[PDB]
Amino acid sequence: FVEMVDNLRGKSGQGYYVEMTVGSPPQTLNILVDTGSSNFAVGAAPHPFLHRYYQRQLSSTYRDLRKGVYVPYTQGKWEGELGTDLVSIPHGPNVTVRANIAAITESDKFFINGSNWEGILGLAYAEIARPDDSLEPFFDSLVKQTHVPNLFSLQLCGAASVGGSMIIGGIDHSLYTGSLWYTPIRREWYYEVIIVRVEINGQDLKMDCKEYNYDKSIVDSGTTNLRLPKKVFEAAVKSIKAASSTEKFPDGFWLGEQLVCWQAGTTPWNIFPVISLYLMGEVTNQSFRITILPQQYLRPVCYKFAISQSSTGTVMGAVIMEGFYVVFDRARKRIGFAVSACHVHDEFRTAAVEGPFVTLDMEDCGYN
């Protein structure tokens, strides 16, 4: 899949985008890759932040669905006009498909000033599509209309320009070391998974594991941080504070309300603990663990604390994903994790994927 390697770009904190074309003749756009939503939506008007936008008037293959879509999400909102058109991914499979496209005609806090992307590719499932689950997501259309296998994988590499790979329809084994370990997709809406145990520097938090997944845990390329439920975030910080008590930091730092800065070339990585999430495995009573470093959760801006509290559950965002090659195995309803060939690490500690472990009562970890 060499043609798809290095097909993602981005700027720090502004997401990862892939080149796409829409319409006939083809209009090229950069599109944010988002495993945490399920609509394909593109700028269709001359917003001042946009390098370019979809011009339906130039497309002979454009079809109007004569229906609007309104999408407020936690951090912004957009609204648009639904249609279909022919869509391709130049550095993807050599196919062209007719997909649903929301032509964005009004927005607030959606486009980023100074970014190089003009739309969003929602890769999650129809259950959370807008206006409802009858609006077929892009990936579903791709698989239905072609012989592209029902899976994709993401290598998000981080740094400021970031880079990565989206392998559509398969897996590139050069992008990871060791073995893939798979956790089941609990339910096909978000890419929902179940965390069964959490260790900070090898130390279990000992919470009712239900707490780790209240009300859900998801794998989300469209979120920068590792987000955690309050109750779990509270315990998580308490232990990270203690682990890092060598040096002192304000209360705002832990809330992501102020930055902490060290002199260039002298950050104390080693005073900060590793974070290990044990995920439900493929077999009864069997789990595995993924382990990330402070280089993943302490983000350059001076650094931000990139773990934060949540009201909608755990979100394994770019802080988690940049450690790993992540396989969205839709065909087998599972997500694979392996150590990424590009993850950033020091000489003493590196990101890990390890198994098998014995974990009982893992089904009691899911919130209903």
Ligand SMILES: CC1(C#Cc2cnc3c(c2)[C@]2(COC(N)=N2)c2cc(-c4cccnc4F)ccc2O3)COC1
């Ligand atoms: C499930 C439903 C949705 C949605 C949704 C719509 N638009 C979005 C997003 C979600 C974001 C928010 O979180 C995620 N995962 N996608 C998102 C992140 C970004 C963004 C910003 C900075 C860095 N990375 C990003 F992905 C930009 C733009 C952006 O636009 C359907 O009704 C709720």
